[PDB]
């Protein structure tokens, strides 16, 4: 499936208007300039409610925009007015953009995105360990690592040779790794006793059944 690209409209002439002072900055930099365009379009409940928003950012300020619930370009800041008006006047420009909600968004979801992103199921690796310095004193931690998984929805739980325990339980946040996989760490403040069997319950990403790992006696 070929993905469609969001197009950026050219900025009108742009004579070079002198924007009166604002609230700049400094104390350690040089002279640099950054431009940014992005065709972000929000999906919700399948492809039933999409919302397309193209934003153009100067330096670090959105100066011009196009909202799907508006139906046209609206200047987010004065230096946008030039662009917002011209682009809203050319059917060649404004009707093409107005069309990206389907050509550059519904298209991609239903095409590439479904046969790609939406079908990404990477099962989580799980193993428990022993941390927290030395033994009985106030230090005796059990860590259950849940790694290399995707999608992000996941549920992890501890178990003391029987029931679910919640006290002394701490789990990191999502923790993205950048390569389309997540990993989350779950600690457990405890004390090992003869016969005690702790287990770590993980579930979802790609497990048709909740997996479990035991840490014997």
């Amino acid at each position: 499936f070929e993905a469609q690209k969001a197009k950026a409209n050219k900025a009108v002439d742009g004579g070079g208007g002198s924007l009166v002072p604002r609230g700049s900055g400094g104390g350690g930099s040089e002279r640099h300039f950054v431009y940014q365009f992005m065709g972000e379009c929000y999906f919700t409940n399948g492809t039933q409610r999409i919302r397309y928003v193209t934003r153009y950012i100067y330096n670090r300020e959105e100066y011009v925009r196009y909202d799907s619930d508006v139906g046209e370009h609206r200047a987010v800041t004065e230096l946008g007015r030039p662009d917002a008006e011209y682009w809203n006047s050319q059917p060649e420009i404004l009707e093409r953009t107005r069309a990206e909600l389907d050509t550059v968004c519904r298209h991609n979801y239903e095409g590439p995105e479904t046969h790609t992103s939406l079908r990404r199921l990477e099962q989580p690796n799980v193993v428990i360990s022993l941390s927290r310095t030395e033994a009985l004193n106030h230090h005796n931690t059990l860590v259950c690592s849940v790694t290399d998984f995707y999608p992000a929805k996941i549920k992890v739980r501890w178990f003391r040779n029987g029931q679910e325990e919640t006290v002394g339980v701490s789990s990191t946040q999502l923790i993205r790794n950048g390569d389309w996989t997540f990993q989350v760490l779950v600690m457990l403040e405890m004390t090992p006793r003869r016969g005690e069997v702790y287990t770590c319950h993980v579930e979802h990403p790609s497990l048709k059944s909740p997996i479990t790992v035991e840490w014997k006696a």
Binding site: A3, A6, A11, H32, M38, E40
Partner: protein, 182 residues
């Protein structure tokens, strides 16, 4: 805002001083691919993905031109106001749990980068090591700043140590994020 899945596409970034460009497609915080502007080719991060979907590289080159144009303008249209530098963060952490001798990847997460001109160098006991090293495209943040990732393919041993080196015009001097299995 309010939405299950979010598809970020045609992300086009360009910097005046340096003719610096980046063209990317993102999905739920993850990079679908980036277009090498030099080689002029779509590079997917997930090769499996590349085998099921495709993208015409000229589209990206095509957008940079626009972005490139549009910049000069705003530049002009703005009495030439420069962008203000920022101080980036840094978090290192292993892809998977540390297990001596067994291959692992050290991750160096940098957020709040701006402008998108940063230097990230891996330090093994103070020895600027370069190889088995990988880096990601700049990621978009809400406040329009960015965050990038670097990866160090290494072998863990309870002796040597490491240090992710970050340099940015926003920091008086290189920030050192230290990580070690001990």
């Amino acid at each position: 805002i309010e939405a299950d899945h979010v598809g970020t596409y045609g992300i086009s970034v360009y910097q005046s001083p340096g003719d610096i460009g980046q063209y990317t497609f993102e999905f739920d915080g993850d990079e679908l691919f980036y277009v090498d502007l030099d080689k002029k080719e779509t590079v997917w991060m997930l090769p499996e993905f590349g085998q099921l979907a495709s993208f015409d590289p000229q589209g990206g080159l095509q957008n940079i031109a626009v972005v490139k144009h549009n910049l000069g303008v705003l530049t002009k249209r703005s009495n030439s106001t420069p962008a203000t530098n920022e101080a980036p963060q840094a978090t290192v952490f292993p892809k998977s749990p540390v297990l001596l001798g067994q291959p692992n990847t050290l991750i160096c997460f940098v957020d709040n980068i701006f402008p998108p001109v940063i230097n990230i160098t891996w330090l093994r006991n103070s020895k600027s090591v370069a190889d088995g090293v990988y880096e990601t495209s700049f990621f978009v943040n809400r406040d329009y700043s960015f965050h990038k990732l670097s990866y160090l393919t290494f072998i863990p041993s309870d002796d040597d140590i490491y240090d992710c080196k970050v340099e940015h015009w926003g920091l008086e001097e290189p920030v050192l994020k230290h990580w070690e299995p001990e």
